[PDB]
Amino acid sequence: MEVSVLIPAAGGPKAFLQVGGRTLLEWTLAAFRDAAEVLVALPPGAEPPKGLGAVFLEGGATRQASVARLLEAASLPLVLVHDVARPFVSRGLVARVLEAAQRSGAAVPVLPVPDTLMAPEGEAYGRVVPREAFRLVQTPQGFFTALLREAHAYARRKGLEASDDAQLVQALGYPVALVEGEATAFKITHPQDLVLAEALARV
Amino acid sequence: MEVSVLIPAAGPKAFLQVGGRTLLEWTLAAFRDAAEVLVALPPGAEPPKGLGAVFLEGGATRQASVARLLEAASLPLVLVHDVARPFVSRGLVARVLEAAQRSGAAVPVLPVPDTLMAPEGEAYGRVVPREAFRLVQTPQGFFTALLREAHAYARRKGLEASDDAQLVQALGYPVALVEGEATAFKITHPQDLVLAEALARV
């Protein structure tokens, strides 16, 4: 009913972090349950859970390496790549990313920067920059599978490592379109992120 | 606390409902133990009847509303807070206040949580190192006389800035940083409400 989803979850393992009666992995698998194919990377030695609708492989040392591994196994001409630390991604966000990726070949959800944006002078406080000029980049990021393969191939040759797939595609000279992200699709990174995640999980 | 709390809720937004309470009521509960609470509201907006805050007309901008509230602030320490950040814990308030008392000017900051990118057009564009940057919240805490001087000097110079720390900085006075809170996000867009009303439940 949709198409090809890559989950580079090889960062115990982050994929098995419990958030309100579902692991992170279980949360993303629910968000993409309409996808034709879900491929998940797990750290070597970590045992894939039984009976979920997904194919598992061993991830590399970096998210990027895990994506490349997953990508080789992708069977469909369109891919969504998603951070497992973003459990609360809505069906609306997915469809919006996918829809734009189908047309444009590369599409990323973004949010405006909500707060004054400041660079500490060690101290700090420090130097403020116009938050209106900047965005917070989220996932899923959507691509033609063939394009993301080209991006990863060129990155391998150049030794380019970047924090997301959009940056690899950009290095090809390929335009990456932006769509509206969502406040609920926040990344669980720090201890207070986890606590806030338990609140949204109940509803 | 002791301690003037200024809520520049002007520059209706204050009356936005989030769970059981309006945004204003969330803020008043967060600063329930402050000796003096001053709230700015848009002209024509009528204050609710038994909240124990003191109300003044706000200005055209949030900064101008803070400047108006500072006229009336009578305690030697001041916290200034965005009414659109309802979920401010007690620990956060005490962190900011404590650091204000120690150094005279302090703000809460969060790490930038996502890849930080400057669009080129409507297209992806330039990525900057997020670890070098912070998100600034609120409350911001100061010796009242310093914030008053910072506002006077800004008005004199025509300086307009997105928070109070930048005004104090323009005086050449150091501003300390403390740890913020993920829950102290600003409600700006209709989907922030989504996140808020879920947090409101607990």
Swiss-Prot record, chain A:
GO biological process, one term: isopentenyl diphosphate biosynthetic process, methylerythritol 4-phosphate pathway
Family statement: Belongs to the IspD/TarI cytidylyltransferase family. IspD subfamily.
Pfam families found in the cross-reference section: IspD
Transmembrane segments: none
Gene: ispD
Keywords of the record: Isoprene biosynthesis, Nucleotidyltransferase, Transferase
InterPro entries given in the database record: IspD (IPR001228), IspD/TarI (IPR034683), IspD/TarI_cytidylyltransf_bact (IPR050088), ISPD_synthase_CS (IPR018294), Nucleotide-diphossugar_trans (IPR029044)
Protein name per its UniProtKB record: 2-C-methyl-D-erythritol 4-phosphate cytidylyltransferase
